[PDB]
Amino acid sequence: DLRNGAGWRDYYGSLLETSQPDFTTLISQWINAFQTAVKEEYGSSSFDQVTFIKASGQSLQGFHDNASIHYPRSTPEPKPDGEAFKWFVANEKGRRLALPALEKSQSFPIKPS
RNA sequence: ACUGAAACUGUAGUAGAACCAAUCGGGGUCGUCAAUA
């Protein structure tokens, strides 16, 4: 039950039961208000191409390339010892990959050498 | 060349009105560490 203050002013205007406005006719308007504000203030020709929107969507959605999510490690299997740093030292001596941009959805290699 | 007597500083009046002990915060999570020879 969402109303503007004019709708609440009508609600408090009576002790009798009164119609509530159907927010479901307005939800698209409000969401588009948000989307047009994001486009206009952050300089984009689309809402879903705003970088923080594009990134945030990928987070909620996950990664479509079916590479597994796990912390970096040198073996595809998680070894029973806390030695995942071995990937990072291999990365430091290897290709020295940065964490890929969330929008780009690029997976790390298990050997960053 | 005679002490006055006797007479309750009491009677009425609410230390009270107003004020939210409150505002913000996912019980959460990943890269090494160490300095010589």
mmCIF file of C-alpha atoms (C1' of nucleotides) in Angstrom:
data_model
loop_
_atom_site.group_PDB
_atom_site.id
_atom_site.type_symbol
_atom_site.label_atom_id
_atom_site.label_comp_id
_atom_site.label_asym_id
_atom_site.label_seq_id
_atom_site.Cartn_x
_atom_site.Cartn_y
_atom_site.Cartn_z
ATOM 1 C CA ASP A 1 0.000 0.000 0.000
ATOM 2 C CA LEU A 2 1.925 2.996 -1.356
ATOM 3 C CA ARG A 3 0.439 6.484 -1.686
ATOM 4 C CA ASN A 4 1.672 10.015 -2.077
ATOM 5 C CA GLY A 5 0.893 12.574 0.599
ATOM 6 C CA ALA A 6 -2.209 13.624 -1.299
ATOM 7 C CA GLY A 7 -3.420 10.034 -1.095
ATOM 8 C CA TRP A 8 -2.585 9.895 2.605
ATOM 9 C CA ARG A 9 -4.327 13.225 3.115
ATOM 10 C CA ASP A 10 -7.464 11.537 1.745
ATOM 11 C CA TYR A 11 -6.853 8.480 3.944
ATOM 12 C CA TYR A 12 -6.609 10.527 7.140
ATOM 13 C CA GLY A 13 -9.533 12.596 5.955
ATOM 14 C CA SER A 14 -11.925 9.830 6.990
ATOM 15 C CA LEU A 15 -12.629 7.275 9.690
ATOM 16 C CA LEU A 16 -14.543 5.228 7.117
ATOM 17 C CA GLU A 17 -12.845 2.701 4.862
ATOM 18 C CA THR A 18 -11.680 4.386 1.674
ATOM 19 C CA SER A 19 -10.249 3.328 -1.677
ATOM 20 C CA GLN A 20 -6.545 2.761 -1.834
ATOM 21 C CA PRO A 21 -4.809 3.704 -5.092
ATOM 22 C CA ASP A 22 -3.438 0.721 -7.009
ATOM 23 C CA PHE A 23 0.343 1.128 -6.944
ATOM 24 C CA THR A 24 0.607 -1.584 -9.625
ATOM 25 C CA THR A 25 -0.425 0.942 -12.262
ATOM 26 C CA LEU A 26 2.397 3.254 -11.161
ATOM 27 C CA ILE A 27 5.318 0.909 -10.430
ATOM 28 C CA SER A 28 6.544 1.054 -14.033
ATOM 29 C CA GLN A 29 6.409 4.848 -13.938
ATOM 30 C CA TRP A 30 8.551 4.995 -10.779
ATOM 31 C CA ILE A 31 11.091 2.436 -12.032
ATOM 32 C CA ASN A 32 11.383 4.342 -15.316
ATOM 33 C CA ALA A 33 11.785 7.555 -13.319
ATOM 34 C CA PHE A 34 14.758 5.942 -11.589
ATOM 35 C CA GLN A 35 16.157 4.621 -14.862
ATOM 36 C CA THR A 36 15.866 7.941 -16.707
ATOM 37 C CA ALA A 37 17.513 9.784 -13.812
ATOM 38 C CA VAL A 38 20.423 7.325 -13.860
ATOM 39 C CA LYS A 39 20.821 7.718 -17.631
ATOM 40 C CA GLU A 40 20.622 11.490 -17.497
ATOM 41 C CA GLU A 41 22.876 12.123 -14.514
ATOM 42 C CA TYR A 42 25.431 9.428 -15.445
ATOM 43 C CA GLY A 43 25.792 10.190 -19.109
ATOM 44 C CA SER A 44 24.595 7.024 -20.809
ATOM 45 C CA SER A 45 22.518 6.272 -23.886
ATOM 46 C CA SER A 46 20.901 3.383 -21.993
ATOM 47 C CA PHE A 47 20.148 2.559 -18.366
ATOM 48 C CA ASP A 48 21.510 -0.997 -18.567
ATOM 49 C CA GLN A 49 24.760 0.323 -20.083
ATOM 50 C CA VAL A 50 25.510 2.529 -17.075
ATOM 51 C CA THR A 51 28.657 0.930 -15.697
ATOM 52 C CA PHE A 52 27.498 0.547 -12.102
ATOM 53 C CA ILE A 53 24.112 -0.707 -13.338
ATOM 54 C CA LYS A 54 25.786 -3.070 -15.813
ATOM 55 C CA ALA A 55 28.124 -4.336 -13.079
ATOM 56 C CA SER A 56 25.405 -4.627 -10.431
ATOM 57 C CA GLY A 57 23.204 -6.667 -12.771
ATOM 58 C CA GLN A 58 26.026 -9.114 -13.457
ATOM 59 C CA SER A 59 26.452 -9.608 -9.714
ATOM 60 C CA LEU A 60 22.762 -10.375 -9.160
ATOM 61 C CA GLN A 61 22.718 -12.586 -12.241
ATOM 62 C CA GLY A 62 26.069 -14.372 -11.795
ATOM 63 C CA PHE A 63 28.371 -15.513 -14.584
ATOM 64 C CA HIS A 64 27.007 -17.125 -17.736
ATOM 65 C CA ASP A 65 30.231 -18.795 -18.915
ATOM 66 C CA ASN A 66 29.782 -21.632 -16.344
ATOM 67 C CA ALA A 67 33.282 -21.161 -14.960
ATOM 68 C CA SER A 68 33.075 -22.087 -11.278
ATOM 69 C CA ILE A 69 33.218 -19.389 -8.634
ATOM 70 C CA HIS A 70 36.019 -20.063 -6.172
ATOM 71 C CA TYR A 71 38.883 -18.195 -4.580
ATOM 72 C CA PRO A 72 42.078 -18.377 -6.647
ATOM 73 C CA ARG A 73 44.151 -21.527 -6.318
ATOM 74 C CA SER A 74 46.743 -23.382 -8.355
ATOM 75 C CA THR A 75 44.776 -26.659 -8.608
ATOM 76 C CA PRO A 76 41.208 -27.047 -9.913
ATOM 77 C CA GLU A 77 40.430 -29.113 -6.853
ATOM 78 C CA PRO A 78 40.538 -27.322 -3.494
ATOM 79 C CA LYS A 79 43.540 -28.830 -1.755
ATOM 80 C CA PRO A 80 42.958 -29.707 1.919
ATOM 81 C CA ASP A 81 45.613 -27.134 2.919
ATOM 82 C CA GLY A 82 45.244 -23.357 2.965
ATOM 83 C CA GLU A 83 47.667 -22.795 0.079
ATOM 84 C CA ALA A 84 45.536 -20.697 -2.285
ATOM 85 C CA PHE A 85 48.222 -17.996 -2.036
ATOM 86 C CA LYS A 86 50.195 -20.168 -4.464
ATOM 87 C CA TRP A 87 48.029 -18.863 -7.305
ATOM 88 C CA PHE A 88 48.730 -15.272 -6.274
ATOM 89 C CA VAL A 89 52.495 -15.737 -6.184
ATOM 90 C CA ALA A 90 52.259 -17.467 -9.569
ATOM 91 C CA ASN A 91 50.238 -14.483 -10.758
ATOM 92 C CA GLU A 92 52.826 -12.066 -9.372
ATOM 93 C CA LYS A 93 55.579 -13.839 -11.297
ATOM 94 C CA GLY A 94 53.262 -14.626 -14.237
ATOM 95 C CA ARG A 95 50.830 -12.470 -16.217
ATOM 96 C CA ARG A 96 50.076 -10.295 -13.156
ATOM 97 C CA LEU A 97 46.348 -10.265 -13.868
ATOM 98 C CA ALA A 98 44.134 -7.712 -12.200
ATOM 99 C CA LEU A 99 40.721 -8.801 -10.981
ATOM 100 C CA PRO A 100 38.669 -8.572 -14.198
ATOM 101 C CA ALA A 101 35.954 -5.949 -14.454
ATOM 102 C CA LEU A 102 32.633 -7.253 -13.192
ATOM 103 C CA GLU A 103 30.866 -6.115 -16.366
ATOM 104 C CA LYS A 104 33.326 -8.023 -18.562
ATOM 105 C CA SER A 105 32.627 -11.399 -16.883
ATOM 106 C CA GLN A 106 36.175 -12.644 -17.579
ATOM 107 C CA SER A 107 37.334 -15.724 -15.660
ATOM 108 C CA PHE A 108 40.809 -16.212 -14.184
ATOM 109 C CA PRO A 109 43.008 -19.062 -15.431
ATOM 110 C CA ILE A 110 44.030 -21.710 -12.966
ATOM 111 C CA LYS A 111 47.629 -21.137 -14.128
ATOM 112 C CA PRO A 112 48.226 -17.362 -14.337
ATOM 113 C CA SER A 113 51.827 -18.025 -15.418
ATOM 114 C "C1'" A B 1 -0.066 53.986 97.024
ATOM 115 C "C1'" C B 2 0.511 47.822 94.242
ATOM 116 C "C1'" U B 3 2.350 43.389 87.412
ATOM 117 C "C1'" G B 4 -4.487 43.853 83.968
ATOM 118 C "C1'" A B 5 -7.160 39.867 82.268
ATOM 119 C "C1'" A B 6 -8.004 36.898 78.096
ATOM 120 C "C1'" A B 7 -6.526 35.974 72.396
ATOM 121 C "C1'" C B 8 -3.235 29.274 67.972
ATOM 122 C "C1'" U B 9 0.031 33.945 62.766
ATOM 123 C "C1'" G B 10 -3.466 31.270 61.242
ATOM 124 C "C1'" U B 11 -6.887 30.370 56.844
ATOM 125 C "C1'" A B 12 -7.037 28.592 50.927
ATOM 126 C "C1'" G B 13 -3.289 26.955 47.163
ATOM 127 C "C1'" U B 14 -0.966 19.213 43.799
ATOM 128 C "C1'" A B 15 6.498 21.621 42.390
ATOM 129 C "C1'" G B 16 3.977 21.230 37.994
ATOM 130 C "C1'" A B 17 3.260 21.514 32.162
ATOM 131 C "C1'" A B 18 5.886 19.929 27.875
ATOM 132 C "C1'" C B 19 9.867 16.425 25.665
ATOM 133 C "C1'" C B 20 9.900 8.814 21.994
ATOM 134 C "C1'" A B 21 16.719 7.731 25.051
ATOM 135 C "C1'" A B 22 16.971 8.063 20.341
ATOM 136 C "C1'" U B 23 19.755 8.137 15.205
ATOM 137 C "C1'" C B 24 23.467 5.014 11.556
ATOM 138 C "C1'" G B 25 25.655 -0.185 11.256
ATOM 139 C "C1'" G B 26 24.175 -7.853 6.939
ATOM 140 C "C1'" G B 27 27.872 -11.424 12.642
ATOM 141 C "C1'" G B 28 30.772 -10.644 8.315
ATOM 142 C "C1'" U B 29 35.015 -12.583 5.267
ATOM 143 C "C1'" C B 30 41.115 -15.044 1.190
ATOM 144 C "C1'" G B 31 46.054 -14.230 -0.017
ATOM 145 C "C1'" U B 32 50.614 -15.394 1.731
ATOM 146 C "C1'" C B 33 54.179 -14.790 5.539
ATOM 147 C "C1'" A B 34 59.510 -13.912 6.736
ATOM 148 C "C1'" A B 35 64.965 -11.336 5.243
ATOM 149 C "C1'" U B 36 68.900 -12.480 4.278
ATOM 150 C "C1'" A B 37 73.710 -14.222 1.867
#
